Structures are given as C-alpha cells and as structure tokens.
Amino acid sequence: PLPTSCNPSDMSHGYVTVKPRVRLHFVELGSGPAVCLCHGFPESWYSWRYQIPALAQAGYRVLAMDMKGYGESSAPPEIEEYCMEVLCKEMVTFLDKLGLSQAVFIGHDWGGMLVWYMALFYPERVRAVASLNTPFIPANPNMSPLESIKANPVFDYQLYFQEPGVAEAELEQNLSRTFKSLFRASDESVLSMHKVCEAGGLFVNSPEEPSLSRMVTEEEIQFYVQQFKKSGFRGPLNWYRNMERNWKWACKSLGRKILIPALMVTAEKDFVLVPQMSQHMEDWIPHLKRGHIEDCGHWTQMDKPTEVNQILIKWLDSDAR
C-alpha cells in the first residue's frame, strides 16, 4: 500500500525572495516543528510526495523546497551561484524571511550534501539534520577534488557534467526519455555510468524508448517533464561544477564536529552513494543515529516510501520533537 501522495494543485505554494534575482518556491503542509525537505539532482519538491502527507500527519510543519535551479525557483545561469556557500547562506535567509529560528533539515543526494553543510556551518539554525544516501566526509585539505573524483570510477559521470552545455544538450533532447531512463529501480537500470566520458554521454547506450519503471507512473514522469521545461538542466548541473570552491569552503570548518542530532540513512542498492561511504561518520558527528533500507536504490523516497517514512518519523519523534 503506497502512502498518500500529493496533488500539486491541492498544495499551498510559497515564495520567498532571498535576494533581488533569487526567489525560492516551496510547498507547505501541516503544523508543528518546521521540517525543510531538500531534494537532489535532477529532482523536484515532488520527489517528496510520499513523505509530505505522512510527516504532516505525524505532527510536523513540512516545507518541501524547489532547490535553486529547479521548478518554480529562480535558475540564474552563473556556475558560482550554485556553490554550497551561496546555497547555504540563501537557506539561512529563507528561514529569516519566514521568521523561523530553526528548522529540521532533511536532504537526499545533493540536497543531503547541502543539509550537512547547513549543520556544519549554521548549527544554531538547524534543529536536527538527516541525510538519505549522501554521507558526510570531511574535506582533505591535502587532496584536490579532481584527484578524489578521478580516484573513484563510479564518479566518472561527474567529469562528464563539468563542461557547460554538453550534458545539458543530452538531457534536454528528450525530457521524457531523460526521466524514464534515470528514475528506475536498481535492477531496472539502463545506465552503466562507467567511462561515460569515454562513451560520449549518459544515454548513448540506453534505449531510445525506455519502458516505465515499476516505481513511477506516466503522469508522474510528465510532471517532471513540465517542470524542466521552465529552466532546463544548466542550473541543476551547476551543482556539480563547484568542486574546488566547495572544498575550499569545507576546509575552513576543519576541526569542528557536528554536535546537533543527526540521522544517516543508507540505501543498499545505491551503487554511487554506497553505504560503506558513511563508515566512521560517528568520528565527526557524536550524536549520529542510523537507518538502512534494503532493496533500495538511489531514488530512495519513491523506491521505499513506507520505509523512509517510518525511519524519519521515529527519528523526528525521538530526536527533533
């Protein structure tokens, strides 16, 4: 039995201008402690559609964002607008304009990376932090990001995403094909993500007309299509084009721990953000709690929504509320 989902037209839609050219969109449901959900690449507030009702029914005020570059949020073209320092400071201003002293931050993928840096640099604004799939790895001030990325074969696609315009052209060519190719269970994968640079793209060796994953409906895919017609993939991809800047900012933390309540949820079949990558996070995050979802790939919220909801609500009730 799938959890209750969300109908976009039935939600409260909010807009906050954090700077003159940057307006952030979100949907809001529920009363209680504020919980801010932060999606990853290339997703939407709607990626949380199975969490938003559940969390509101559990007694939380849910704010599910369109991250900068996505949906109804602003999408400036400049790469540096999407570095973690800029993105984190904009989320602080977002809370300020909403009049929220703090919020729980829950992220997945790139949104998971942003919530860890929020917890690291703005703990006084973060009541508790949870990440789906994305670990918290301290920066190594004697290793370049180029070297780290190049040291792990599963991170090749990240090199492919570097040159502005290249991956955009591939991902924008046929939006249905893009989303139907990406949003698949681990056993339904049509992507190898091996030597994608070498092969000349993500989809060069994937079907022209992919089948629909068991995880999603045609209507759901078409919601994503419509959202990415607004701004396309430049802003989204720009999240990946700040590796050096993000490393330099992360190095300024160095020393400190994250002392707030924290939850790391691993996904057994995410073959990029692998569970093992989270090992020893407790060395830097003394109050860390864990969850683990079996039979679950990269798209955690729609792969195993019931399990996600159970994990988050149990943790929120014990550690955030």
Q: Which residues contact 134 (CB under 8 A, 6 or more apart)?
A: 40, 107, 108, 109, 110, 111, 112, 113, 116, 273
H-helix or E-strand containing 264? strand 262-267
Active-site option among 46, 70, 224, 240 = 240
Q: Is 153 exposed, middle or buried (0-12, 13-18, 19+ CB in 10 A)?
A: exposed
Active site annotation includes 46: no
Q: Which amino acid is at 41?
A: F
Q: Mark 202-221 as b/e (b = at least 16 C-beta within 10 Å).
A: bbeebeeebebbebbeeebb
Active-site option among 46, 50, 109, 156 = 109
Is 157 labelled as part of a ligand binding site?
yes
Active site annotation includes 109: yes
Q: Are 115 and 102 contacting, i.e. CB atoms less than 8 angstroms apart?
A: no
Q: Which amino acid is at 7?
A: N
Active site annotation includes 280: no
Kind of pairing, strands 61-65 and 22-29? antiparallel
The token duo for 37 is: 């959900």
Angle between helices 243-251 and 84-98 (to 10 degrees): 70
Peptide bond before residue 236 is cis, with ω within 30 degrees of 0? no
Active-site option among 70, 160, 298, 303 = 298
Q: Which residues contact 168 (CB under 8 A, 6 or more apart)?
A: 232, 233, 234, 237
Report the distance separating Cα 61 and Cα 143, nearest Å.
41
Residue list, annotated binding site: 157
Q: Which residues belong to the annotated binding site for substrate?
A: 157
Catalytic positions: 109, 240, 298
